[PDB]
Design an enzyme around this catalytic site. Structure first.
Site, mmCIF file in Angstrom:
data_model
loop_
_atom_site.group_PDB
_atom_site.id
_atom_site.type_symbol
_atom_site.label_atom_id
_atom_site.label_comp_id
_atom_site.label_asym_id
_atom_site.label_seq_id
_atom_site.Cartn_x
_atom_site.Cartn_y
_atom_site.Cartn_z
ATOM 1 N N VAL A 145 -1.207 -2.545 -3.793
ATOM 2 C CA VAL A 145 -0.488 -3.627 -4.455
ATOM 3 C C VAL A 145 -1.190 -4.943 -4.191
ATOM 4 C CG1 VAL A 145 1.711 -4.822 -4.739
ATOM 5 C CG2 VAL A 145 1.662 -2.401 -4.080
ATOM 6 N N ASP A 174 15.377 4.676 -2.363
ATOM 7 C CA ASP A 174 14.458 4.124 -1.340
ATOM 8 C C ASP A 174 14.934 2.728 -0.880
ATOM 9 O OD1 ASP A 174 12.187 4.258 0.344
ATOM 10 O OD2 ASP A 174 10.710 4.191 -1.198
ATOM 11 N N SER A 234 0.839 -1.198 0.000
ATOM 12 C CA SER A 234 0.000 0.000 0.000
ATOM 13 C C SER A 234 0.877 1.254 0.000
ATOM 14 C CB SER A 234 -0.941 0.020 1.212
ATOM 15 N N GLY A 235 0.251 2.416 -0.126
ATOM 16 C CA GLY A 235 0.998 3.657 -0.089
ATOM 17 C C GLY A 235 0.160 4.827 -0.513
ATOM 18 N N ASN A 236 0.843 5.919 -0.838
ATOM 19 C CA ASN A 236 0.167 7.095 -1.344
ATOM 20 C C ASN A 236 -0.422 6.785 -2.724
ATOM 21 N N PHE A 237 0.286 5.944 -3.477
ATOM 22 C CA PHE A 237 -0.134 5.543 -4.829
ATOM 23 C C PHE A 237 -1.478 4.813 -4.855
ATOM 24 C CE2 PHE A 237 2.601 2.231 -3.075
ATOM 25 C CZ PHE A 237 1.900 1.065 -3.333
ATOM 26 N N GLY A 238 -1.760 4.082 -3.794
ATOM 27 C CA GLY A 238 -2.874 3.168 -3.797
ATOM 28 C C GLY A 238 -2.443 1.825 -3.265
#
Length: 266
Positions: free
Chosen positions: A23, A124, A17-21
């Site tokens: 996985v 990263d 998960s993340g800011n992107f949306g």
């Protein structure tokens, strides 16, 4: 590179998960291939730049991209690493052996050496972004901040301070917004610390500014319980303040390679 929504099946198993949306796990008809799928104006461009980076990379210790797909959302389809992030793996497998940890971090150094030779900066490089194919096979993932270096520059200069894994960043990154393979070597030292501490977060209890201040007093994280002296020494060499005297990955990889089969022989 451009893939067929018809040949992709998304499961309901979230991998990240993340800011992107999000996985999610899935299947892609090639045999079928098990895949991890990154699913999402800023986001799309970031996704496409990521895909354009992974597509250029070919190494056994880097996660391979299958391709991209525009369906419900923009989606980036990668090889699956079934055992998942290294930090979580070690947190729930507290008995993994020291030799085994050395094997995995050595693998990541072989991957980063390749990245260095290819003139890409990762930006990263953290234990969360190392994914396990098996207990004995690590690949590097998450190229979302990564950069192809310009032909005349040994570093990438960011214009503004993004949303950054600041506890993995070198002083030149924090101070000058400058990112080189050597900056990734610093990150690598933290990642090694994470690996030998079985997936504990670095600089626990500390804000980004307190880390900067600690690093400035010349202070460094303590040696993890059970961590070999030779590996703490390598950690500390990765955390050379001055970019010019800090090793490159060829140097770091060779150190690990040598120590690894010293151990293998014991």
């Amino acid at each position: 590179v451009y893939l067929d929504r018809k040949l992709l099946t998304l499961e309901d198993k979230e991998l990240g998960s993340g800011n992107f949306g999000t996985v999610k796990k899935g299947y892609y008809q090639m045999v079928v291939k098990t895949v991890a799928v990154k699913i999402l104006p800023a986001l799309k461009d970031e996704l496409l730049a990521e895909a354009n980076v992974m597509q250029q990379l070919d190494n056994p210790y880097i996660v391979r991209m299958i391709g991209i797909c525009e369906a419900e959302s923009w989606m980036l389809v990668m090889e699956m690493a079934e055992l998942g992030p290294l930090n979580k793996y070690l947190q729930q497998n507290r008995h993994v052996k020291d030799k085994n940890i050395i094997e995995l971090v050595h693998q990541v150094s072989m991957g980063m050496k390749y990245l260095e030779e290819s003139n890409f900066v990762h930006r990263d490089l953290a234990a969360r972004n190392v994914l396990l194919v098996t207990q004995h096979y690590a690949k590097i993932s998450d190229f979302g901040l990564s950069k192809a270096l310009r032909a005349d520059e040994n570093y990438y200069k960011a214009q503004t301070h993004g949303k950054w894994p600041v506890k993995w960043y070198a002083p030149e990154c924090i101070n000058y917004y400058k990112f080189s393979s050597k900056s990734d070597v610093w990150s690598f030292g933290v990642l090694m610390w994470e690996a030998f501490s079985y997936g504990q977060k670095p600089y626990r209890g500390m804000k980004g500014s307190e880390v900067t201040a600690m690093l400035e007093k010349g202070e460094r994280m303590g040696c993890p319980a059970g961590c070999p002296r030779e590996m703490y020494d390598l950690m500390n060499l990765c955390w050379t303040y001055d970019v010019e005297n800090r090793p490159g990955f060829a140097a770091v990889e060779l150190r690990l390679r040598n120590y690894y089969y010293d151990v293998v022989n014991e």
